[PDB]
Specification:
heterohexamer, A: mainly beta, Hemagglutinin (Ha1 Chain), Chain: A, domain 1, eight-stranded mixed beta sheet, four-stranded antiparallel beta sheet, elongated, B: rod-shaped, binds a molecule of 3 linked components (NAG-NAG-BMA), binds the ligand CO[C@]1(C(=O)O)C[C@H](O)[C@@H](NC(C)=O)[C@H]([C@H](O)[C@H](O)CN)O1, binds 2-acetamido-2-deoxy-beta-D-glucopyranose, viral protein
């Protein structure tokens, strides 16, 4: 080997691991605060405060709700034929035309909201024997009286309101949404003055369905000078089907159809400011980053967003246990 | 944790080790020195990043859903709309809570494991030439200069080269 | 160092762990019966059998359902202005006044049940031209005829039933629940005898909504001497809104409003005895202790309760594996 | 379990050990004895209580919910009310079943671990003076009276004090 | 002791584990492709393509939907008194009798679908003063006119339609389902021609409930020569209760009751072929084997089936890590 | 994995071992051989089958449920019918993904464990007569013919029989 290898000394080698002065407490199966070298937060808990206007198409409703934009309240005429990925409804929105109510408001707002388009096609309905284009002073269009842009208020011509019986075929290859309505007068006098018959009736049908609504006379609360109301209804007509509108008084007739589509559109109630930035996840509190897996900003989301969770902090250990060598 | 190296037979960490997560300090002929071990540091780091990326893998996207805030009192249907969401939230919250608990538990045993594996690897290598002092330090029973310490660390140490020197020093003595 | 230890002997040290004669089988990732030293049960599977009357406010409905207590069936007059955290409805409950039906009984029972109060405020409705306070012998109040305490049956005065058109403003700062109804006569004769007009009509509205119900004449099955029915409806009036009740016959008028609140109240169907004890979790089978995390007593709960689970036993190992030394 | 001490290299437990979960039995110059080890017993117990308390942490409370029992046949809405609850129950049942399975699996490896850690600790301490008989017993190659057995147990044993005695007894012999 | 005699040498023993040339990648907590010796698939992702006709009782609806089989459209008379565990409705089904609509079609299809029986009992209703058994040429039964087998169209006798007021007690110990309906005429002339009264009315009630429907006159779209429609309704009568049918015109009367039961029956829309084989799990795509825990074939299932999952493959490692000698 | 035997101190597997999952390879003065170890192979296999059967335990059965495909647009109630199912599917998908991840992770550490337990068992048995070469091979310092190799494998090896031969060969030499 060598010869008498005599140098009898020794050495010491010690294995160890790092430790940090600071350190973060995390939960475990067996402990709920154990300190580790480092951790990362898995709950997103803060919004920017603004709804980024990119990548989704945000449509700010300003002071129109979606249904008033749909019906064509004069003040919402800005929205005709408009489209959106997300329609934001503001708390300040107001209606300002003939007082109306929508029996299943919630389904009509939904059904339009996810169709994502207000594209309207006017069709040539011929109403013989009635006066078209009725309006009201509660729905001022400019200086004059007016009514919803997408609806057509029929009243008597001379001394008679005939039985209207019209039909409109769906010859296209898409579904057609028709919004129509009925006028509920305040007085039997109002009824006969406008529609002659003392009891109106509206029946709208297809090969598949039918709705017959009869009006209801009575005073409701004064809203914009009126005690009458109109109630809104809808009928979808499938390709190849046919719409038949049959009435004897009180019909608020459709002027054509909204076309329906299938997409990722929805509606959101938010007063957050829209701003220019790209963000995939929208919350009524403004956009939030979807880098973390869970979020605690709001349970309402649109887009690629973290899963809402009750916790506001969940730290994932990304290091060993911290066992400090003093602590400085 | 499960292996009892970290916060176990190794009394505490070195706040001074800044160049890696696991490593060596020696005291020899030329003096005392410290060195991070980069293979076990990378093994530990890669596993924690692997774990990390799996958790941040795809936020799924959702568009039109159901209403979750209501302004009027409606009864039966609104009660169900509320109940569907409240039970969805509690289930996702349970999931998040359990996930970080399992994950964190495992990250502590994984890092405890890598410490212990580095120890075992060094033990195996020194063969009959060193003894375990039991606190994560080996007593090397032969003259081992800095190049000797570096060959242990970089994994090229030849035990045979020092075996008779070490065995003499370690056993013979006077008993 | 030391001197001649003449004797040089050895010793034996052995490490081991305990074991118990008994032992409990638990499930594992890899085994489904492995025996451990000890375990603890995580499923609560037994009730006391009694609903503890503390800490929640239990209201025992005795032989009144919540809706009859609301309407004011004579026999439920005990409950006027009552309140509860949990209203317990008993299987033995019975109605015993004018036969009625509630179109969406399930929402009205819910809506009242979580409001948690039957506080009634009478308001000064003035019904001019009709006879108030009609009652029936099927709703005996004491020796006499009677009707629901909270409703007011209007019939003609002399030879006329006018068009009633009344209004009641919500000037307070809380929502008001109004319960009203309509009488469906058995015969056209009954209709004209009571309400003169051969076809009644009730329209109740606010600025936001309206309901017009018209009665339906026809014989239903004899219930407490009667073939007529009254159907119950409800209208909530928000602060600042206004109620307008307009009718021409068949109205069963409200006497005022129930006030609504927001709380933790609910209703439960149970025949379990109420008893004095404190228990947070209530099940229709009686209270159960919420010390364990899961329970298998009933999927209906109220209060701080364990999560209902299909399993009836789940043992959590609280000890090592049992490896005993004798045979079996 | 994972370490193979319990129900592994240690053939079976002692039904007679009533004073702790892990411990020692010896035979030395002065007779035979048994003694529980309280540090590993407390380590094992504390971890299982930690686990236990996390599982019994907060029953959340729920007040008005949806109806879960019906007396009439109604169709579409009641079908959904039933489906929401049935899918909620199966999900919570899955959760409970998986939770105790993971938990229990871990409790057996945790306790297997503490047994093996106690063994390793005692090994390290006896240094070159004892040999592992492989059944969880060490053969101590030097005269070790009761106070010597006590110093191993309470962790103050000095191997140097007996090293030449032990090394002589253990190696030299006749080969 | 043991005496070597002469030889002096050593041996080498090495422990190792197997490895396979092939190997399967699986996901882990820390890796998402790590290669193991072997794995097993947990997601069932393929159907046989056929609905096995065993063990459940599959009833193929051929060109009848469940509701037409229920009402008794001539062409569905094959199904009278039929029963099923699963009724399969085919996309090709068609109706071919008097045009009708069912207000809550979805609940009636459900309610019948899980009752699982079309057992019909005829009861002796006596209709005095009206002409029974009306039929139509749009519902041809054989060469002649016809109508739904389970319904009875009443029209005037001579010059009068009386007020019908009939009753049928539930004296049995099971619930009775009664399907009845109302005819909506196209013209006021049709109304008076058939039912004399210019406004019909149908009220069907029990001790517990009542429905009064009034018809609606108007033209709907021509369907099989007709613009009239009949709308279908249902009433369940509990044991001890009583049905009272009261009408004054337009009633399409029940001929008796369907009996209801409680079972595991349901309905499925599928064009898959029924075939002979035993399979517990049915999917609208055909049966699938329930050996794996999760499936990705379809979210609609009937029977003992795997839990539907978005993933189409999930491999469970059933072997150690593969560390081969050469490569992979 | 956690023990660092497989894909750890044991460099790679033997594609040639076809008769079991874990085993031995030897080289002595009589020849070379290979033999599977059947006890550790059965231990590993039984645990993985245990795990497997628990996962395939009972598909629960469901009959009438809610509609999950619609042909008309209806609004509020159909939105909820869709939302109930979509949140049920994502929750069951989360469950499946997490389940195979935990499971697979554990199967790799379990098999790593059995490898290391076989190693430790063999170590314990050879006592002072062999040294660990550190790559999962022991160097046996005494003449060990094929019956000797068989007794180590079948667990009947008597270390005492060769202790003086081995201790001489292993230590004495010339240092
Ligand atoms: C039926 O009863 C209701 C409630 O009493 C009557 O409604 C009230 O009718 C008056 C007269 O039209 C309304 O007056 C107007 O109020 C506005 C705002 O204050 C004011 O600008 C006008 O000068 C006028 O005073 C009153 O607001 C209205 N109130 C409600 C709550 O609707 C209704 O007229 C009665 N109808 C019949 C036919 O008897
Ligand atoms: C329409 O048809 C129904 C059913 O046939 C008639 O109902 C029945 O009317 C009679 C006479 O009022 C009821 O008699 C009562 O029986 C009880 C005992 O149950 C007795 O205490 C009373 O003094 C009286 O005799 C009978 O119960 C009742 N049955 C049902 C099921 O309602 C109804 O009267 C007919 N109406 C007209 C206007 O034709
Ligand atoms: C109310 O208006 C509707 C729509 O204009 C009228 O419906 C149409 O009525 C005609 C005459 O009955 C139907 O014609 C028939 O069609 C069949 C199939 O082509 C054919 O066999 C007959 O020879 C005849 O042409 C037409 O199909 C029908 N269209 C629709 C969409 O229903 C209805 O008649 C009007 N009613 C009244 C009372 O004015
Ligand atoms: C009060 O005067 C007005 C109005 O609203 O301004 C004038 C308007 O030209 C007239 N429109 C038509 C088509 O008749 C209406 C309606 O008669 C009422 O609104 C019925 N409630 O009344
Ligand atoms: C049968 O006699 C009574 C009754 O019920 O006791 C007498 C009672 O004073 C009378 N009440 C009024 C206000 O008219 C009622 C109703 O006329 C009927 O119930 C209508 N179905 O009838
Ligand atoms: C058109 O002729 C028929 C028909 O349908 O074949 C002749 C048939 O005997 C007659 N049935 C009765 C009971 O009146 C019906 C109905 O009058 C109409 O369908 C009312 N829409 O009309
Ligand atoms: C803590 O962990 C996160 C995620 O691994 C990482 O980005 C961060 O840099 C870590 N901190 C340090 C000081 O290493
Ligand atoms: C809306 O779009 C349709 C389809 O191109 C068009 O014909 C119509 O005139 C448009 N109207 C407005 C107001 O943009
Ligand atoms: C988000 O918005 C809701 C309702 O607007 C509010 O209660 C919540 O605290 C907000 N959270 C954050 C992070 O802004
Ligand atoms: C290991 O260390 C010794 C001393 O520095 C050196 O000669 C040798 O080449 C090193 N080997 C490697 C692979 O770094
Ligand atoms: C079994 O475990 C439970 C929970 O840890 C504990 O209360 C009980 O005392 C234990 N039993 C024994 C005998 O230690
Ligand atoms: C119910 O409470 C209200 C509000 O204090 C009170 O005015 C009313 O008279 C009470 N009535 C009864 C019967 O207690
Ligand atoms: C609880 O009550 C339900 C219904 O009353 C019953 O089926 C169930 O078995 C009961 N369970 C217990 C533990 O009482
Ligand atoms: C350990 O044991 C020895 C003998 O009993 C005793 O002298 C010593 O002080 C003990 N130390 C401790 C810390 O118990
Ligand atoms: C792979 O695993 C499955 C399930 O354990 C088993 O049936 C199959 O035989 C295994 N493959 C091999 C080659 O062992
Ligand atoms: C249907 O079954 C009932 C009950 O046995 C029987 O009376 C009736 O005549 C059956 N009708 C047909 C068409 O099978
Ligand atoms: C099953 O059927 C659905 C709808 O018919 C189809 O989209 C899906 O891809 C099919 N999957 C398989 C495995 O057949
Ligand atoms: C172990 O191996 C030796 C040599 O083959 C043999 O004599 C002995 O009986 C074997 N024992 C067992 C249990 O196989």
């Amino acid at each position: 080997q060598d010869l008498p290898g005599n140098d009898n000394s020794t050495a010491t080698l010690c294995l160890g691991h790092h430790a940090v002065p600071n350190g973060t407490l995390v939960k475990t199966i067996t402990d709920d605060q154990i300190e580790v070298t480092n951790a990362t937060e898995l709950v997103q808990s803060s919004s920017t405060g603004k709804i980024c206007n990119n990548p989704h198409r945000i449509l700010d409703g300003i002071d129109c709700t979606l249904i008033d934009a749909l019906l064509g309240d004069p003040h919402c005429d800005v929205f005709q034929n408009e489209t959106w990925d997300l329609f934001v409804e503001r708390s300040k929105a107001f209606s300002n035309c003939y007082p109306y109510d929508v029996p299943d408001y919630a389904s009509l707002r939904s059904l339009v909201a996810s169709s994502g388009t207000l594209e309207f096609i006017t069709e040539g309905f011929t109403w013989t024997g009635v006066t078209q284009n009725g309006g009201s002073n509660a729905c001022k269009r400019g200086p004059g009286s007016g009514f919803f842009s997408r609806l057509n208020w029929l009243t008597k011509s001379g001394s008679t309101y005939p039985v209207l019986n019209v039909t409109m075929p769906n010859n296209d290859n898409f579904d057609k949404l028709y919004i129509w309505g009925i006028h509920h007068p305040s007085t039997n006098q109002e009824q006969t003055s406008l529609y002659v018959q003392a009891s109106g009736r509206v029946t709208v049908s297809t090969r598949r369905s039918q709705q017959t609504i009869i009006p209801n006379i009575g005073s409701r609360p004064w809203v914009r000078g009126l005690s009458s109301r109109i109630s809104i209804y809808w009928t979808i007509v499938k390709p190849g089907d046919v719409l038949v509108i049959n009435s004897n008084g009180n019909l608020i007739a459709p002027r054509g159809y909204f076309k329906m589509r299938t997409g990722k559109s929805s509606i959101m109630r938010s007063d957050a400011p829209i701003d220019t930035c790209i963000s995939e996840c929208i919350t009524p509190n403004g956009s939030i980053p979807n880098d973390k897996p869970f979020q605690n900003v709001n349970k309402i989301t649109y887009g690629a967003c973290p899963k809402y969770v009750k916790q506001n902090t969940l730290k994932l250990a990304t290091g060993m246990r911290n066992v400090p060598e003093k602590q400085t | 944790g499960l292996f009892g190296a970290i916060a176990g037979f190794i009394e505490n960490g070195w706040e001074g080790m800044i160049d890696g997560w696991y490593g060596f300090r020696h005291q020899n002929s030329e003096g005392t020195g410290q060195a991070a071990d980069l293979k076990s540091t990378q093994a530990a780091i890669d596993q924690i990043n692997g774990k990390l990326n799996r958790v941040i893998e795809k936020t799924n996207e959702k568009f039109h859903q159901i209403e979750k805030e209501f302004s009027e009192v409606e009864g039966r249907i609104q009660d169900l709309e509320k109940y569907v969401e409240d039970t969805k939230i509690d289930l996702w919250s349970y999931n998040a809570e359990l996930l970080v608990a399992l994950e964190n538990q495992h990250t502590i045993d994984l890092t405890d494991s890598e410490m212990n594996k580095l120890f075992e690897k060094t033990r195996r290598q020194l063969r009959e030439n060193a003894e375990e002092m039991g606190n994560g330090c080996f007593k090397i029973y032969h003259k081992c200069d800095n190049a000797c310490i570096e060959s242990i660390r970089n994994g090229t140490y030849d035990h045979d080269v020092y075996r008779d020197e070490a065995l003499n020093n370690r056993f013979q003595i006077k008993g």
